[PDB]
Amino acid sequence: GRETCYACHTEVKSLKENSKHAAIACTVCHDKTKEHLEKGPDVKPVTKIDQAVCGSCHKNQYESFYAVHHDPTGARKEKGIPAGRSPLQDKLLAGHGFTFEHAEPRGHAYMVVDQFAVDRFQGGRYQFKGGWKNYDKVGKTWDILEDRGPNAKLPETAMAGNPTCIQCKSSDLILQWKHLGEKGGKFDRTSNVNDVVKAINNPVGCIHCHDPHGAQPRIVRDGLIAAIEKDPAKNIFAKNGKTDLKVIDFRGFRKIGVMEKTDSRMMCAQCHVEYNCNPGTQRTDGKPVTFADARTNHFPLKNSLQLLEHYRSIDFFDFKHAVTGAKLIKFQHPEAETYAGSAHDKAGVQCHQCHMPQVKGKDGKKYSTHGVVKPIQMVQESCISCHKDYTPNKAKFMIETIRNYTKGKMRKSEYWLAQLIDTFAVAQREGVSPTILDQARLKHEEAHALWEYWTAENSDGFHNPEQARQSLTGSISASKAGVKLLNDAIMAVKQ
Amino acid sequence: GRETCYACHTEVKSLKENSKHAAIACTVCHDKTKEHLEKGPDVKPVTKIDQAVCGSCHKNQYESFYAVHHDPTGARKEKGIPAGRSPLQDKLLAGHGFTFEHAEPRGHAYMVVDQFAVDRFQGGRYQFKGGWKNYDKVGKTWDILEDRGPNAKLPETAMAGNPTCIQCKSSDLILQWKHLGEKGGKFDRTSNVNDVVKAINNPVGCIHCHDPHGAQPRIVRDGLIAAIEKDPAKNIFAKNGKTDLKVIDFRGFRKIGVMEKTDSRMMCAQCHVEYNCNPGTQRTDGKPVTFADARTNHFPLKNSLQLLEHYRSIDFFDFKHAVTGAKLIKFQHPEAETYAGSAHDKAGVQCHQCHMPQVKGKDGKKYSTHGVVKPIQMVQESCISCHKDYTPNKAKFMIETIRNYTKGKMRKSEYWLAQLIDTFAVAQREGVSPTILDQARLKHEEAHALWEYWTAENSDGFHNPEQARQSLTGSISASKAGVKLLNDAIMAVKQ
Amino acid sequence: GRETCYACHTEVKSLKENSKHAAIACTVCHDKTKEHLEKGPDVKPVTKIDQAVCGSCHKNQYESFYAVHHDPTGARKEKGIPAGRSPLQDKLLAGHGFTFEHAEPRGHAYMVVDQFAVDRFQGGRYQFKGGWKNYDKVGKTWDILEDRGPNAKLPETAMAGNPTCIQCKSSDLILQWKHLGEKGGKFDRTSNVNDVVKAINNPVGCIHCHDPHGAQPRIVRDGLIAAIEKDPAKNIFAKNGKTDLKVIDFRGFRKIGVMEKTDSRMMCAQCHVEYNCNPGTQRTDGKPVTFADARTNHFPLKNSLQLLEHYRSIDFFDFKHAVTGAKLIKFQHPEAETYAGSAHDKAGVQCHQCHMPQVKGKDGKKYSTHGVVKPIQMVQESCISCHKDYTPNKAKFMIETIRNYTKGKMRKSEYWLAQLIDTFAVAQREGVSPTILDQARLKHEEAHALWEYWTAENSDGFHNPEQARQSLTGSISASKAGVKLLNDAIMAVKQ
Numbered sequence A, B, C: 001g002r003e004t005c006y007a008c009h010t011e012v013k014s015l016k017e018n019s020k021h022a023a024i025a026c027t028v029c030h031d032k033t034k035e036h037l038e039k040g041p042d043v044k045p046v047t048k049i050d051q052a053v054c055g056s057c058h059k060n061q062y063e064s065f066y067a068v069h070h071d072p073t074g075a076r077k078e079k080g081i082p083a084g085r086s087p088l089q090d091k092l093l094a095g096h097g098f099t100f101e102h103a104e105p106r107g108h109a110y111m112v113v114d115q116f117a118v119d120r121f122q123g124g125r126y127q128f129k130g131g132w133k134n135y136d137k138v139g140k141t142w143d144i145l146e147d148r149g150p151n152a153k154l155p156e157t158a159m160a161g162n163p164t165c166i167q168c169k170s171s172d173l174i175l176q177w178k179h180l181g182e183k184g185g186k187f188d189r190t191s192n193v194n195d196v197v198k199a200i201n202n203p204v205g206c207i208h209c210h211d212p213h214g215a216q217p218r219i220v221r222d223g224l225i226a227a228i229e230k231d232p233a234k235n236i237f238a239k240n241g242k243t244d245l246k247v248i249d250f251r252g253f254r255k256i257g258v259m260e261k262t263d264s265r266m267m268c269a270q271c272h273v274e275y276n277c278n279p280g281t282q283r284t285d286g287k288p289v290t291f292a293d294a295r296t297n298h299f300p301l302k303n304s305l306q307l308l309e310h311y312r313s314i315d316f317f318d319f320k321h322a323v324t325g326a327k328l329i330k331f332q333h334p335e336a337e338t339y340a341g342s343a344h345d346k347a348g349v350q351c352h353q354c355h356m357p358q359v360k361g362k363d364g365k366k367y368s369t370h371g372v373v374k375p376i377q378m379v380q381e382s383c384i385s386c387h388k389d390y391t392p393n394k395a396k397f398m399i400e401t402i403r404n405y406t407k408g409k410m411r412k413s414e415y416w417l418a419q420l421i422d423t424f425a426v427a428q429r430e431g432v433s434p435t436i437l438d439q440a441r442l443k444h445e446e447a448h449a450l451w452e453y454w455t456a457e458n459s460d461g462f463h464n465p466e467q468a469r470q471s472l473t474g475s476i477s478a479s480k481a482g483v484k485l486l487n488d489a490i491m492a493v494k495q
């Protein structure tokens, strides 16, 4: 009966006919279709967004996404500890909700539960049922978490969660959210986040990267489609002055982007980017930037060396540093923007080659693992598969040397920003002129942008070692210049 | 001839007859008994306190206690290093003898030698014979250590050792120390520690936890029996408004506590607790608290959330912080008080199930290992034995996740106390009012009590994750409140 | 024809005849000898300094020196990171070029390339060809590095490289450098370093430690021969009031030192020592000390407890600390001076026994490995070979316990110097008297000398645990004394 459907749903016909999934009957994925025909287009069919339906025919992709592994060093790894990825986090992000809890990432299957349970999300409201002993459970959100209710309080939490956060954790609102989270769907940017979490049962769906109608490689993230549309010729995924994306607009309500050829750069960039998904402040007037404003669901697609200019051009910053008052940018996991134009990218390698390598299942069917891999833990498939001359030690050696050298500059930029911050408080206290203190704030802005990008980014330089060195040494230079300007000023007091 | 003995030693008869050790002749453990009969009760028999006599019939318990293992990461692990368990120790304990040396614990067989040789004990007087190459030797104290004499000095040492320390290192003074170390035995609290160390040949004896007369599970520690007697209904080991302990008082001179059923919580709490075993100061008048005072050999049996109130109620603190002058409590290894009322305790699990698991000896006799185990290093017997569904990775994952999350809050509380301490010195220097500085000291008291308990405790949260989170976030809140009060005050100067 | 040569080269005859290499024809190592005879001693023969000629008859020594290994934790390990060997490097060495980059050592075959490429050498001018993916390549310098040219700049670099540096990286200038780098050879101390690097093709040559003419164990380093000649009776390698070295002086131009018996202490001390190879300042007048001055290529051969006195006696220091102005000594890898008079040295063990242990090659020929070994990574040959009762765990345990205890004192001395430095800036700012500030500078001098020696030295105490404890506790004492003097002074302001 698809022809009857197709009379009214012509884009679906275009994706589905003569495709890999051509023969799949509609009722496989959609329930209540008879009521939809009979009663008309008031009675919408039900589209349950759900991995297990793809799993029925794609079991190795489904099993590997859900497989439970246990890293013997644990998870919930706070970054802000002496031996961690961001040892001076509490000082350098003073004034930001990340200081309440920010841990290293873990597996994809945990993404909703970890978003909802982290100390910075919603005041500790949502917790794992049964506590720590069930921290490794996968599946449905509300089988794993419980809701302690709106009036419960837990000490040293924050309330940074909002609806836009969910757009990088699940495909469950694909039909229930208007492009950008503008008003008109069941939920939008201004929704109460605690109404929204109830509807998220599942982590990133299979449909996030694969069209259900015709199995075409795709993107569904609003912010990512929008950024590419803004900059169709020069954006990080472009080639030859265009990008391999066709935007399909459904009813004026929501878009997808279909690509002729798999580009896991774009598919992983639906989440692995710097973004704004939060309220902020305007640099010019200091006016609030609320969820009313499109700037609160936004993807720059710019790297470390471009981002301070970019946020100044859209008159936006995230928080004032608690000590210096500097108008800082908060950075988050810019892996796509870092990877852009690195040695591997310019070689045509994509994220999935190192992070979703080929493994054999079952009997012995070849597939891309959909439990994403930490390359250092799997160098034979993530690296040696292509670098056939490498031994596992060599692969490890190369990953660690680059991170070693990058980390040395990261720790040195932190030492310098801490010096900047300590010098500034001294300079204040001895009331050095607000003019001078303001020159120092620009120094902080610059040194912070060129530093925090790399604690937020998760490769410690491996994704782009040149850009990391350039950025971090820029940060150091910025901070030592601020420290010299302030000390010059502090002397000039009793002068 | 035991009947003749029994005419005069009626408690022994009560422990020994119809027991597991009924048939053991007295002369097995006691020498000079004929002179005792013949010459009378002036000539006391000799009771050599000594593991090797139990070993003669209990070889697997004896061999496993003495077995030498070599951890390839070494021992003598100072806590106060950037990657260690207490990275800000030197700043936060400024003014306390722990700043001279405080290392992580190692095996039981080393306990006397490590107490005597640590840099904080007695000015470096006692050293390992032959130096580092014999650091792993077990056995008799004075076969392993040498006495460089009373006038030798070693730089950057302290002289914190006293007799009461020995009561958690050996059973060797069981007959030679009057309850609490009151005057009347060969040694008491006011003895010169260098007279006492000469009499300690052996680490914790087999008799510390097992009655020699009838093999009944027991405690011998004075401080522990006393605390339970103070609080027989509500103490951490109680149940149903009483505790499973019968106190046996010998001649008015020394007590034991026998339990009808093995409770390794109590048996390990003879040492693994917070204690006072040191001189201190009175909070009200600032008067010294010397060894004359019973407060110097004392067990609170209270957890992190109760201890500041408890030490205020007995008008006692350990040291003024070198910078802030805050009247701090010094905390030590409160493992029993932490474990109380945690998930495993409420499940009826005891310390020995994870730390003394079942192993097979010899031929293949089943026994509890008496070389106490670090569970993460032995998850198959310490964890999987009960959690039969766990893989070794899962067990490790659970231990490390909890420690990971706990440690993130510990490091964040340290960042905050360091901020408190740095802010205070600023506030002083700019002479903010001693009234305000005093409000800040209370903040320090509170934030320190809720922080240092967890560096002293050895599980990094695993023993009680809820109480750890509650305490540490309390510390943070306390410190950020102090820092806000002081900064408010520091501005109010040039105001 | 050697007799004809010998008529004019009589020292060579003395080394070569009746030796292990007696039969080797001259033309094996020297080309153009006929032109030298025919045209005379204007046409010098060519002596290509080159491992591969020794390799032709000594293949196992050559292969093991060049073998490529890949440490899976990587290389380029910056010291100045929280978990590294010198976590407070940026603060404590403020004002020195080491703050731009100082990493842990790696294999011998990398020594030239790492000297030329490090961020502190020559402004980033020299880089690995092909970047990170060729960081593990060995062989010829200029097959591995490229020269970006004199006008290229890279941010956050330094320009500390000079010709004297090369003397601890290669044997390539053995015939082209006059003793001490005095003027007269192709290169000397005042040469432009960028003229010199072009002539260094190879790392340390086989000839650095082995005479080519007669295979005698030897030294070629100018600074080392000179120090031993200064102090022939009492120097660290002496015995019975002399040293086992015969100095051979060729034409007044360059010296070797031949030893009757292998002493790898001396042979490794050609580089593994504290040295001055840099310009400096005079303590008395503050006058520059330039390459004109012999003090710029100099070996003290003194340990941690002697070096401050030694540098004061030759009126030399390296840099003023950027904050305190203290006239500091910069220390570098004093492994020979530390090892002197330690337990292993007094037992007659030499560096090569632990670092070049016996291995079997090829078929199964026994040899000393010439890829120098990190003992902890090879305890069976580096330790158990002599300590036959040791298990690999025990060996590891002993190395790590000593480093553990040593590191605890190192981190505590760093905490104290940082306190000194922070206190001093406070004391300045509140202008405490330059007299008092000067007493503090002496405190800094002393605490720095007794601290930085051990971050520079590479064993973390294992080479000499007693001297390490003595030095580091001396540093702590020095710093806490400075901190007390300054605080006493800072109070005495508003007094």
Ligand code: HEC
Pocket (backbone or CB within 6 Å): A002, A005, A006, A009, A012, A016, A024, A025, A026, A027, A028, A029, A030, A047, A048, A049, A174, A175, A207, A212, A213, A250, A251, A254, A256
């Ligand atoms: C699972 C394998 C599917 C099969 C087979 C079919 N559809 Fe589908 N459809 C499915 C998903 C998961 C979604 C949600 C949105 C997304 O792009 O992933 C949908 C959505 C539709 C819609 C809504 C389009 C819009 O206007 O915004 C229509 C109208 C739809 N699906 C129709 C449709 C028809 C007519 C089918 C048989 C020919 C059919 N679908 C098969 C998943 C699946």
Ligand code: HEC
Pocket (backbone or CB within 6 Å): A104, A105, A106, A107, A108, A109, A110, A111, A112, A114, A115, A167, A168, A169, A170, A204, A208, A264, A267, A268, A269, A270, A271, A272, A351, A352, A355, A356, A372, A373, A374
């Ligand atoms: C948004 C819906 C996402 C998309 C699309 C991709 N990733 Fe992701 N990733 C995301 C989250 C929120 C997390 C953290 C989950 C948590 O609960 O902590 C991650 C985690 C990873 C990791 C770490 C994996 C692990 O430790 O086990 C990697 C390596 C990873 N992500 C890479 C990755 C790649 C290559 C993608 C395209 C194929 C990709 N991610 C998609 C969010 C989302």
Ligand code: HEC
Pocket (backbone or CB within 6 Å): A105, A264, A265, A268, A269, A272, A335, A336, A339, A344, A349, A350, A351, A352, A353, A354, A355, A373, A374, A375, A376, A377, A399, A458, A459, A460, A462, A463
């Ligand atoms: C091989 C040439 C890679 C490509 C292409 C991409 N990544 Fe990567 N990633 C790489 C390494 C060696 C590391 C360091 C940590 C490791 O595990 O080895 C990383 C790190 C990540 C992380 C951190 C999680 C983890 O895997 O440890 C993420 C979240 C990640 N990378 C994502 C990512 C994305 C989105 C990519 C394309 C834009 C990308 N990676 C490319 C190796 C390689």
Ligand code: HEC
Pocket (backbone or CB within 6 Å): A342, A343, A344, A347, A349, A353, A354, A375, A376, A379, A382, A383, A384, A385, A386, A387, A395, A396, A398, A399, A464, A465, A466, C131, C132, C133
């Ligand atoms: C093929 C699909 C690749 C996979 C998977 C990985 N690498 Fe790679 N690498 C590849 C190419 C074509 C290049 C370009 C230069 C060249 O040899 O042609 C590289 C580059 C590197 C480098 C240098 C990187 C830099 O920033 O300059 C290293 C150190 C490297 N590659 C190692 C590496 C490792 C460890 C991988 C697993 C994470 C890995 N690569 C994946 C081809 C491919």
Ligand code: HEC
Pocket (backbone or CB within 6 Å): B002, B005, B006, B009, B012, B016, B024, B025, B026, B027, B028, B029, B030, B047, B048, B049, B174, B175, B207, B212, B213, B250, B251, B254, B256
């Ligand atoms: C070792 C297995 C023992 C055997 C058999 C017996 N005794 Fe014992 N006794 C032993 C120890 C290790 C100690 C010290 C204190 C402790 O409680 O562990 C003792 C102590 C006694 C005492 C002193 C009691 C007091 O008044 O404070 C008496 C009087 C004593 N032991 C008597 C005794 C008699 C009469 C025995 C044979 C029937 C006998 N003991 C057996 C260890 C051992």
Ligand code: HEC
Pocket (backbone or CB within 6 Å): B104, B105, B106, B107, B108, B109, B110, B111, B112, B114, B115, B167, B168, B169, B170, B204, B208, B264, B267, B268, B269, B270, B271, B272, B351, B352, B355, B356, B372, B373, B374
């Ligand atoms: C006082 C006499 C003690 C009793 C009773 C118990 N323990 Fe203990 N323990 C004590 C000391 C002084 C030390 C440190 C020894 C040193 O020289 O450093 C310890 C050490 C442990 C450890 C660490 C073991 C190791 O690293 O190898 C654990 C796990 C341990 N202690 C647990 C433990 C348990 C469960 C007890 C009751 C069965 C117990 N201890 C008794 C002091 C004393």
Ligand code: HEC
Pocket (backbone or CB within 6 Å): B105, B264, B265, B268, B269, B272, B335, B336, B339, B344, B349, B350, B351, B352, B353, B354, B355, B373, B374, B375, B376, B377, B399, B458, B459, B460, B462, B463
């Ligand atoms: C299993 C449910 C446990 C019980 C009951 C007890 N402990 Fe524990 N302990 C546990 C873990 C997982 C850890 C973390 C470190 C590890 O090695 O895995 C600990 C830690 C200790 C330590 C530190 C020494 C060490 O084992 O690493 C001590 C000294 C210790 N625990 C003592 C102790 C006491 C006295 C207990 C009953 C009050 C107690 N533990 C219970 C696991 C478990």
Ligand code: HEC
Pocket (backbone or CB within 6 Å): C002, C005, C006, C009, C012, C016, C024, C025, C026, C027, C028, C029, C030, C047, C048, C049, C174, C175, C207, C212, C213, C250, C251, C254, C256
């Ligand atoms: C390699 C195995 C060699 C053989 C065989 C011979 N010589 Fe050599 N010689 C060689 C080296 C590597 C060097 C450089 C300096 C050093 O001491 O390593 C030399 C140096 C000479 C010199 C210069 C001495 C000086 O006056 O400063 C002479 C004159 C020399 N070598 C002569 C010589 C003669 C006459 C030989 C055959 C009998 C001969 N050499 C063999 C390496 C080798």
Ligand code: HEC
Pocket (backbone or CB within 6 Å): C104, C105, C106, C107, C108, C109, C110, C111, C112, C114, C115, C167, C168, C169, C170, C204, C208, C264, C267, C268, C269, C270, C271, C272, C351, C352, C355, C356, C372, C373, C374
């Ligand atoms: C000057 C010509 C040297 C002589 C002679 C010796 N060593 Fe050395 N060593 C030197 C350098 C410059 C380096 C660093 C190389 C780099 O590129 O980083 C080293 C390194 C070592 C190491 C570390 C080895 C490694 O990590 O793989 C050791 C253990 C070592 N050196 C010891 C050593 C010994 C025992 C020597 C005499 C036999 C010796 N070195 C000679 C410089 C020179």
Ligand code: HEC
Pocket (backbone or CB within 6 Å): C105, C264, C265, C268, C269, C272, C335, C336, C339, C344, C349, C350, C351, C352, C353, C354, C355, C373, C374, C375, C376, C377, C399, C458, C459, C460, C462, C463
């Ligand atoms: C065995 C008794 C040794 C002797 C003799 C020498 N060294 Fe050593 N060295 C030793 C150990 C156990 C360590 C600690 C690090 C390890 O790898 O085990 C060291 C360290 C070094 C280093 C650092 C590089 C490294 O090997 O990790 C160097 C550069 C080094 N030692 C040099 C050196 C020299 C020059 C010696 C004679 C003066 C010397 N070592 C003696 C063990 C032993």
Ligand code: HEC
Pocket (backbone or CB within 6 Å): A001, A002, A004, A005, A006, A007, A008, A009, A026, A030, A033, A034, A036, A037, A041, A044, A045, A046, A047, A175, A251
């Ligand atoms: C003609 C008139 C038809 C026919 C024959 C079918 N559908 Fe639809 N359908 C139609 C309209 C106008 C609407 C939506 C109006 C609106 O809310 O904007 C729809 C909606 C759907 C949806 C859901 C979109 C959402 O969840 O927001 C699905 C999944 C869907 N239709 C499927 C479908 C199938 C399988 C049909 C043949 C059985 C079919 N439709 C017939 C209009 C018409």
Ligand code: HEC
Pocket (backbone or CB within 6 Å): B001, B002, B004, B005, B006, B007, B008, B009, B026, B030, B033, B034, B036, B037, B041, B044, B045, B046, B047, B175, B251
């Ligand atoms: C009756 C009178 C007896 C008899 C028949 C025995 N003992 Fe004792 N014993 C007795 C007294 C009054 C004392 C101690 C007086 C004092 O110092 O307080 C003791 C002491 C012991 C002790 C030592 C206690 C200590 O070390 O402080 C031991 C181990 C002991 N007695 C054992 C013992 C045995 C085995 C006897 C039968 C052979 C025996 N005693 C007989 C009084 C009397």
Ligand code: HEC
Pocket (backbone or CB within 6 Å): C001, C002, C004, C005, C006, C007, C008, C009, C026, C030, C033, C034, C036, C037, C041, C044, C045, C046, C047, C175, C251
């Ligand atoms: C007599 C006259 C002879 C004879 C028969 C030989 N050589 Fe030499 N050689 C001689 C002199 C005076 C000089 C150097 C003068 C100077 O520059 O100081 C040399 C030099 C060498 C060198 C090089 C030293 C350097 O590189 O600076 C070598 C390697 C050398 N000679 C080797 C050599 C051999 C193998 C001879 C026999 C074939 C030989 N020489 C003959 C003087 C005389």
Ligand SMILES: [Ca+2]
Pocket (backbone or CB within 6 Å): A274, A275, A276, A329, A330, A331, A332
């Ligand atoms: Ca952002």
Ligand SMILES: [Ca+2]
Pocket (backbone or CB within 6 Å): B274, B275, B276, B329, B330, B331, B332
């Ligand atoms: Ca205490």
Ligand SMILES: [Ca+2]
Pocket (backbone or CB within 6 Å): C274, C275, C276, C329, C330, C331, C332
């Ligand atoms: Ca030096």
